Amino acid sequence: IPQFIGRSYLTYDNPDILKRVSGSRSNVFMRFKTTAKDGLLLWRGDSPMRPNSDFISLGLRDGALVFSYNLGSGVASIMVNGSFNDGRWHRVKAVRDGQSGKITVDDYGARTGKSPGMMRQLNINGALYVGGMKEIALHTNRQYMRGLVGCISHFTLSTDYHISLVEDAVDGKNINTC
């Protein structure tokens, strides 16, 4: 949904979106914009039991995009820093190779993020939330408890599957006026 204003979350149902993320690769091209200091833009991750939940993420911690792919055995906390808290559009691309990927911001440079723990290929079930989640505090992550704002845009996942953010969803709110 373009033009988030509040805690507007968004889930996904299509079994094609549910599959390109799970594997030995991942891509994102979120062309977001924000005026906050935290938030969540993608939270595909199965029912979080004891911390290992094979979760992927793309946060905006205090002006620091943090690609947080996990495999259970080893966390990853890639990071960039700038003026992302306030301003205008920004082009992300969170490539993965099963154990290694970038967090390439617009022009800052490819801050590579080598961070496996032992293994690869464990991306598992769950819906693909974009822009938030109906309730996120109770979830085991407990890092993106607020900041769920922005005005999101083009989201071509896996470098092929161009996705529309309202045409393939089942939930959400407030398409316009941000």
Binding site: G101, D106, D107, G109, A110, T112
Partner: protein, 259 residues
């Protein structure tokens, strides 16, 4: 076909249109000798290893440039209209972005085609479905500090090849709807290199040339960097021959009498 193909080498000029119904490409299964880039094909392999560098430092500095190739399709329509002019003897010039890794379609392959005073541009992306079909790489440390305000990164490392890695192809002639065109072409290749997020042997891309060899002068009974070299079939008295013509690409048309 080979009945006409051979009798197209030896003095076959276009004799009654040497057409045999076709679906294949007759190569040259002889002493093509793989010469090693005759100094005549030295401009070509130059202009074809620069257009594999301009695309080598542009996908290794801003990796988001690998996810918007269908919106930047005004900048790649000026390359393949340049490779198509790196020589006065050109037929085609063709760029093929490889399919996305672990995917099917070819993702935007173009083609220019010299037709005299013209160059026709087409998209053969809906035909070469599923791509119908590491190197000698020396690092060149990109350094940026020049009081530049456009980028914001001090140092990063790329990979660059040179103009003595262009690959060759045994001379051939293809068939057009099945009716062999007489040209005796040859293809020169190249290869991009993006960045795999550890290394840089990821080969996404290829740029190719097609050159006409029906104007070069083959030399059977001399020694040089030509294609068929020292191939003279002299039933030698004492081996005194004479290559006597300004022939095109015709094998074995010397005169071995030279008493």
């Amino acid at each position: 076909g080979a009945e006409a193909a051979l009798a197209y080498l030896y003095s076959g000029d276009a004799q009654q249109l040497s057409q045999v119904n076709c679906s294949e490409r007759y190569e040259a299964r002889g002493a093509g000798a793989m010469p090693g880039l005759p100094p005549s094909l030295q401009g070509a392999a130059g202009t074809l290893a620069q257009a594999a560098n301009f695309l080598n430092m542009l996908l290794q500095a801003n990796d988001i440039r690998e996810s918007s190739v269908e919106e930047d399709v005004e900048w790649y329509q000026a390359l393949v209209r340049s490779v198509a002019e790196g020589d006065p003897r050109v037929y085609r010039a063709l760029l093929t972005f490889n399919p996305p890794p672990g995917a099917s379609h070819l993702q935007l392959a173009l083609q220019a085609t010299r037709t005299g005073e013209e160059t026709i541009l087409q998209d053969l992306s809906g035909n070469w479905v599923q791509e119908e079909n590491p190197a000698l790489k020396k690092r060149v440390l990109t350094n940026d500090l020049g009081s530049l305000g456009s980028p914001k990164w001090p140092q990063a490392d790329g990979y660059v090849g040179d103009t003595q890695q262009v690959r060759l192809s045994p001379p051939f002639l293809e068939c057009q709807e099945g009716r062999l065109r007489p040209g005796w072409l040859i293809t020169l290749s190249a290869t991009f290199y993006g960045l795999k997020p550890d290394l840089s042997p990821e080969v996404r891309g290829q740029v190719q040339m097609d050159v006409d060899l029906q104007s070069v002068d083959i030399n059977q009974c001399a020694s040089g960097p030509g294609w068929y070299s020292n191939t003279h079939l002299c039933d030698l008295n004492s081996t005194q021959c004479v290559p006597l013509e300004s022939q095109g690409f015709v094998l074995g048309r010397y005169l071995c009498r030279c008493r």
